[PDB]
């Protein structure tokens, strides 16, 4: 039972709307706990989960200061990337950053992540050894050489293996009642005739946490990835998630199909059949 | 808890 902490930063130049927009959200596993928005009135890092509201005023002031410093460097980095790619001050552009760490069930470091994107595509990423960088194109190669000269990898790894893990443990403790939960999915099946010789079987999973889940359709034991439609796992909005998987089947063949549900909250995988 | 801003200029 491993856990995660992650920060997701979005910084958007707005040519025609003044200053850029700076947004950041933090997660433990699939639960959000903080947010920042430079368009909001407070200009402050703000709580978004009940177990983080215990944190005192110096924690919020310290996080706000690191957000402000991050936003200024994203502000300068937008301009640098405009020059690298020969773009215009009239163009809107996006920098995205994800970083964080995973701990095991004992609470100790297991892996760290740091990855930057420009306009929706990989720009530069820290490799798994937290000592090495992957540059996605020639522009990112300039950044990579800069970051090798200024010990960027070590600076990230000290946080990923240190502060990151220690904060994750604190939050896992302080929000133990909710963050350690495992809600198995409640499952069911609908049936919808397409023609008078075809029908849609839909396999539903509801109210599960965490978000990761597998839904597969088998036909007489056969993996059936033929016309198997699958939607994006979605939030219920109450802390749980939903998904469904559908397959079109020949009318009267309904009982040859099975739906299999794999979730961390399930002792054994569930098999479902329209009958 | 956030990482400290630093050594991340492109």
């Amino acid at each position: 039972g491993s856990h995660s902490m992650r920060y997701f930063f979005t910084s958007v130049s707005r040519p025609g709307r003044g200053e850029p927009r700076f947004i950041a959200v933090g997660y433990v596993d699939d639960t959000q706990f903080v947010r920042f928005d430079s368009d909001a009135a407070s200009q402050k890092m703000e709580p978004r989960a009940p177990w983080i509201e215990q944190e005192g005023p110096e924690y919020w002031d310290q996080e706000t200061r690191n957000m402000k410093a991050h936003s200024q460097t994203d502000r300068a980095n937008l301009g640098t990337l405009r020059g690298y790619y020969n773009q215009s001050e009239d163009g809107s552009h996006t920098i995205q950053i994800m970083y964080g760490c995973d701990v095991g069930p004992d609470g100790r470091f297991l892996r760290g992540y740091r990855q930057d994107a420009y306009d929706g595509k990989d720009y530069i990423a820290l490799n798994e050894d937290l000592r090495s960088w992957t540059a996605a194109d020639m522009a990112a190669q300039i950044t990579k050489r800069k970051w090798e000269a200024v010990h960027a990898a070590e600076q990230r790894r000290v946080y990923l293996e240190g502060r990151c893990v220690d904060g994750l443990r604190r939050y896992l403790e302080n929000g133990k009642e909710t963050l350690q939960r495992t809600d198995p999915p409640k499952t069911h099946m609908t049936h919808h005739p397409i023609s008078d010789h075809e029908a849609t079987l839909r396999c539903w999973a509801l109210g599960f946490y965490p978000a990761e889940i597998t839904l597969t359709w088998q036909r007489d034991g056969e993996d059936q990835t033929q016309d198997t439609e699958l939607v994006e796992t979605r939030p219920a909005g109450d802390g749980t998630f939903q998904k469904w998987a559908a397959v079109v089947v020949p009318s009267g063949e309904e009982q040859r199909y099975t739906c299999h549900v794999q979730h961390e909250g399930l002792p054994k995988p569930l098999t479902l059949r329209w009958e | 808890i956030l990482d400290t801003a630093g050594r991340e200029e492109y």
Partner: T-cell receptor, first 116, second 112 residues
Framework: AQVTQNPRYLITVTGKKLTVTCSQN?????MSWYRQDPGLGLRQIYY???????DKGDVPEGYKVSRKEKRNFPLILESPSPNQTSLYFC???????????????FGPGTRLLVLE | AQKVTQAQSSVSMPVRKAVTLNCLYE???????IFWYKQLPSKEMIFLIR?????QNAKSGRYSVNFKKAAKSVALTISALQLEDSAKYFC??????????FGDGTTLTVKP
């Protein structure tokens, strides 16, 4: 590799604007000003985490700073008063949370005396 | 509160021996650093060693820190004292975003 403060010594009269400069040519992101009264420790005035980032310390009143470029971090006293008589230190480091074997550098000090 | 206390104002110890300079702190910060500084009679300020709140006991040359997190005590130990170790030593607390709080110092006299 050094932090420079100018002036190292200054005697000035109450209310006459002054600036104490601090510079380093090591491309350090982090710079910070403190004052040390006799027998006490260093009280943080303002600090700057990088170009165009400043934040108040414990005793910012009567002081301003700016950080237009990495190299300079001036301390501005709009209207010096006698209780700003103190020993002022500028400090810098490559990043605001140095790595294990990384140093915080200090300037030599500025002895400021404000008199009627 | 946010306070760093060095309770001994002066300590004197013979050359070639070891000295321990105590430091207690109160803080609501739960992620932080402790710094040790040396101030010469010339008032030159010199950084000595840094102790991370999640790290093992810091050690560098003749300096070492005995970090007791639950007690909020990070004493500095100087080994094999030399006459040049006579200074005023300062203990300080720093957060993850540039802020710092100093103690008021301990004066160390190394007696020949």
């Amino acid at each position: 590799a050094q932090v420079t403060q100018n002036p190292r010594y200054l005697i000035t009269v109450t209310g006459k604007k002054l600036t104490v400069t601090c510079s380093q040519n090591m491309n350090h992101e982090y710079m910070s000003w403190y004052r040390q009264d006799p027998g006490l420790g260093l009280r943080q005035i303002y600090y700057s985490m990088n170009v165009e980032v400043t934040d108040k310390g414990d005793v910012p009143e009567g002081y301003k700073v700016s950080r237009k470029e990495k190299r300079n971090f001036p301390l501005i006293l709009e209207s010096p008063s006698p209780n700003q008589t103190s020993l002022y230190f500028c400090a810098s480091s490559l990043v605001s949370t140095p790595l294990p074997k990384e140093t915080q550098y200090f300037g030599p000090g500025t002895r400021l005396l404000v008199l009627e | 509160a946010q306070k760093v206390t060095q309770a001994q104002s002066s300590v004197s110890m013979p050359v070639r021996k070891a000295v321990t300079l105590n430091c207690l702190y109160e803080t609501s910060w739960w992620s932080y650093y402790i710094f040790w500084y040396k101030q010469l009679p010339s008032k030159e300020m010199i950084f000595l060693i840094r102790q991370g709140s999640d790290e093992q006991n810091a050690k560098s040359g003749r300096y070492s820190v005995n970090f007791k997190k639950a007690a909020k005590s990070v004493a500095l130990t100087i080994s094999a004292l030399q006459l040049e170790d006579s200074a005023k030593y300062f203990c300080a607390l720093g957060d993850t975003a540039g802020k710092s709080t100093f103690g008021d110092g301990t004066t160390l006299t190394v007696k020949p």
